[PDB]
Design a binder for this molecule. Structure first.
Ligand SMILES: CCc1c[nH]c2ncnc(N3CCC[C@@H](S(C)(=O)=O)C3)c12
Length: 167
Protein backbone atom coordinates (compact mmCIF):
# COMPACT_ATOMS: atom_id res chain seq x y z
CA UNK A 1 0.00 0.00 0.00
CA UNK A 2 1.22 3.55 -0.80
CA UNK A 3 -0.07 7.14 -0.40
CA UNK A 4 -0.82 7.93 -3.98
CA UNK A 5 -4.57 8.85 -4.34
CA UNK A 6 -7.13 9.31 -7.12
CA UNK A 7 -5.17 7.53 -9.87
CA UNK A 8 -6.75 5.49 -12.64
CA UNK A 9 -5.08 2.10 -13.02
CA UNK A 10 -3.95 1.46 -16.60
CA UNK A 11 -1.98 -1.77 -16.13
CA UNK A 12 -0.51 -3.94 -13.41
CA UNK A 13 2.14 -1.27 -12.70
CA UNK A 14 1.13 2.01 -14.43
CA UNK A 15 -1.31 4.54 -12.93
CA UNK A 16 -2.40 7.96 -14.24
CA UNK A 17 -4.00 11.12 -12.87
CA UNK A 18 -4.84 14.63 -14.04
CA UNK A 19 -2.61 16.54 -11.65
CA UNK A 20 0.10 19.17 -11.34
CA UNK A 21 3.24 17.15 -10.63
CA UNK A 22 4.52 19.97 -8.40
CA UNK A 23 1.40 19.88 -6.22
CA UNK A 24 1.36 16.09 -6.23
CA UNK A 25 5.00 15.90 -5.14
CA UNK A 26 4.43 18.41 -2.33
CA UNK A 27 1.50 16.36 -1.01
CA UNK A 28 2.89 12.82 -1.41
CA UNK A 29 6.62 13.44 -0.76
CA UNK A 30 7.55 10.32 -2.81
CA UNK A 31 10.88 8.56 -2.64
CA UNK A 32 11.44 9.54 -6.31
CA UNK A 33 10.04 12.36 -8.43
CA UNK A 34 11.07 12.33 -12.09
CA UNK A 35 12.13 15.55 -13.80
CA UNK A 36 11.78 16.07 -17.55
CA UNK A 37 15.39 17.21 -17.81
CA UNK A 38 17.68 18.26 -20.64
CA UNK A 39 21.33 17.21 -20.94
CA UNK A 40 22.56 20.47 -19.38
CA UNK A 41 20.12 20.27 -16.43
CA UNK A 42 19.00 23.80 -17.34
CA UNK A 43 15.52 23.78 -15.80
CA UNK A 44 13.98 26.68 -17.70
CA UNK A 45 10.43 25.68 -18.58
CA UNK A 46 7.91 22.89 -18.83
CA UNK A 47 7.95 20.38 -16.00
CA UNK A 48 11.59 21.18 -15.19
CA UNK A 49 10.98 24.90 -14.84
CA UNK A 50 8.01 24.22 -12.57
CA UNK A 51 9.84 21.71 -10.35
CA UNK A 52 12.86 23.99 -10.08
CA UNK A 53 10.72 27.02 -9.22
CA UNK A 54 9.06 25.02 -6.44
CA UNK A 55 12.56 24.39 -4.86
CA UNK A 56 13.30 28.15 -4.85
CA UNK A 57 16.07 27.47 -7.45
CA UNK A 58 17.92 25.00 -5.16
CA UNK A 59 17.48 22.30 -7.81
CA UNK A 60 19.26 24.54 -10.35
CA UNK A 61 22.11 25.33 -7.93
CA UNK A 62 22.66 21.62 -7.24
CA UNK A 63 22.39 20.83 -10.96
CA UNK A 64 24.98 23.42 -11.97
CA UNK A 65 27.47 21.87 -9.55
CA UNK A 66 26.64 18.40 -10.95
CA UNK A 67 27.31 19.52 -14.54
CA UNK A 68 30.50 21.36 -13.59
CA UNK A 69 31.83 18.11 -12.12
CA UNK A 70 30.41 15.50 -14.51
CA UNK A 71 29.53 17.21 -17.79
CA UNK A 72 26.23 16.82 -19.62
CA UNK A 73 23.95 13.83 -19.52
CA UNK A 74 23.18 11.70 -22.58
CA UNK A 75 19.83 11.92 -24.35
CA UNK A 76 18.07 8.84 -22.94
CA UNK A 77 20.15 9.04 -19.76
CA UNK A 78 19.55 10.15 -16.20
CA UNK A 79 21.08 11.09 -12.90
CA UNK A 80 19.81 10.93 -9.31
CA UNK A 81 20.00 14.18 -7.34
CA UNK A 82 18.22 15.56 -4.29
CA UNK A 83 14.45 15.87 -4.24
CA UNK A 84 14.79 19.02 -2.10
CA UNK A 85 11.41 19.91 -0.55
CA UNK A 86 9.50 17.77 -3.08
CA UNK A 87 10.74 14.19 -2.65
CA UNK A 88 13.58 12.25 -1.26
CA UNK A 89 15.31 12.05 -4.66
CA UNK A 90 14.82 13.59 -8.08
CA UNK A 91 15.54 11.32 -11.04
CA UNK A 92 16.47 13.72 -13.84
CA UNK A 93 15.64 11.86 -17.07
CA UNK A 94 16.45 13.19 -20.56
CA UNK A 95 13.82 12.19 -23.08
CA UNK A 96 14.45 13.14 -26.76
CA UNK A 97 13.35 16.65 -27.73
CA UNK A 98 11.61 16.47 -31.11
CA UNK A 99 12.02 20.24 -31.42
CA UNK A 100 15.79 19.56 -31.48
CA UNK A 101 15.56 16.70 -34.00
CA UNK A 102 16.46 13.95 -31.52
CA UNK A 103 15.68 10.32 -32.33
CA UNK A 104 12.32 9.28 -30.88
CA UNK A 105 13.60 5.72 -30.45
CA UNK A 106 15.60 7.12 -27.52
CA UNK A 107 12.31 7.49 -25.61
CA UNK A 108 12.43 3.79 -24.68
CA UNK A 109 15.98 4.17 -23.34
CA UNK A 110 14.81 7.18 -21.31
CA UNK A 111 11.97 5.19 -19.71
CA UNK A 112 14.34 2.30 -18.91
CA UNK A 113 15.86 4.54 -16.22
CA UNK A 114 12.59 4.24 -14.27
CA UNK A 115 13.23 0.49 -13.77
CA UNK A 116 16.03 1.30 -11.32
CA UNK A 117 13.39 2.60 -8.84
CA UNK A 118 10.62 0.53 -7.29
CA UNK A 119 8.09 3.40 -7.19
CA UNK A 120 8.13 6.81 -8.94
CA UNK A 121 6.02 9.90 -9.46
CA UNK A 122 6.62 11.10 -13.01
CA UNK A 123 5.47 13.07 -16.09
CA UNK A 124 5.16 11.63 -19.58
CA UNK A 125 8.65 11.78 -21.00
CA UNK A 126 9.19 13.87 -24.06
CA UNK A 127 5.63 15.32 -23.92
CA UNK A 128 4.80 19.01 -23.62
CA UNK A 129 7.52 21.33 -24.87
CA UNK A 130 9.70 18.34 -25.81
CA UNK A 131 7.41 17.90 -28.81
CA UNK A 132 6.54 14.19 -28.88
CA UNK A 133 3.06 12.72 -29.11
CA UNK A 134 1.93 12.07 -25.50
CA UNK A 135 -0.19 9.10 -26.58
CA UNK A 136 2.99 7.54 -27.85
CA UNK A 137 4.88 8.43 -24.69
CA UNK A 138 2.27 6.66 -22.56
CA UNK A 139 2.47 3.58 -24.81
CA UNK A 140 6.28 3.44 -24.50
CA UNK A 141 5.97 3.94 -20.73
CA UNK A 142 3.56 1.02 -20.35
CA UNK A 143 5.66 -1.21 -22.61
CA UNK A 144 9.00 -0.33 -20.95
CA UNK A 145 8.55 0.46 -17.26
CA UNK A 146 8.07 -2.58 -15.03
CA UNK A 147 8.30 -0.79 -11.68
CA UNK A 148 5.36 1.10 -10.19
CA UNK A 149 4.88 4.45 -11.91
CA UNK A 150 2.37 7.15 -10.97
CA UNK A 151 1.98 9.52 -13.94
CA UNK A 152 0.80 13.10 -13.49
CA UNK A 153 -0.71 14.78 -16.55
CA UNK A 154 -1.18 18.53 -16.12
CA UNK A 155 -3.66 19.17 -18.93
CA UNK A 156 -7.18 17.86 -18.26
CA UNK A 157 -8.04 17.71 -21.96
CA UNK A 158 -4.92 15.62 -22.49
CA UNK A 159 -5.56 13.37 -19.58
CA UNK A 160 -9.03 12.54 -20.94
CA UNK A 161 -7.65 11.84 -24.41
CA UNK A 162 -4.92 9.58 -23.00
CA UNK A 163 -7.43 7.55 -20.99
CA UNK A 164 -10.05 7.34 -23.73
CA UNK A 165 -7.53 6.17 -26.32
CA UNK A 166 -5.61 3.77 -24.02
CA UNK A 167 -5.47 0.23 -25.34
C1 LIG B 1 5.05 23.86 -17.27
C2 LIG B 1 4.54 22.49 -17.74
C3 LIG B 1 4.03 21.64 -16.57
C4 LIG B 1 3.84 22.20 -15.32
N1 LIG B 1 3.43 21.23 -14.51
C5 LIG B 1 3.33 20.04 -15.17
N2 LIG B 1 2.95 18.82 -14.69
C6 LIG B 1 2.92 17.77 -15.48
N3 LIG B 1 3.26 17.89 -16.75
C7 LIG B 1 3.65 19.04 -17.26
N4 LIG B 1 3.96 19.03 -18.66
C8 LIG B 1 2.96 19.68 -19.64
C9 LIG B 1 3.55 20.42 -20.87
C10 LIG B 1 4.65 19.72 -21.51
C11 LIG B 1 5.31 18.82 -20.56
S1 LIG B 1 7.14 18.69 -20.75
C12 LIG B 1 7.44 18.42 -22.49
O1 LIG B 1 7.83 19.88 -20.25
O2 LIG B 1 7.70 17.63 -19.91
C13 LIG B 1 5.31 19.39 -19.16
C14 LIG B 1 3.70 20.23 -16.47
Amino acid sequence: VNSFSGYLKLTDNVYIKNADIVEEAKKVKPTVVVNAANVYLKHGGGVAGALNKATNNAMQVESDDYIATNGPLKVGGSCVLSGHNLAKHCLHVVGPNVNKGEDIQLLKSAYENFNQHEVLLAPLLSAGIFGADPIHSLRVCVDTVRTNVYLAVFDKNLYDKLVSSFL
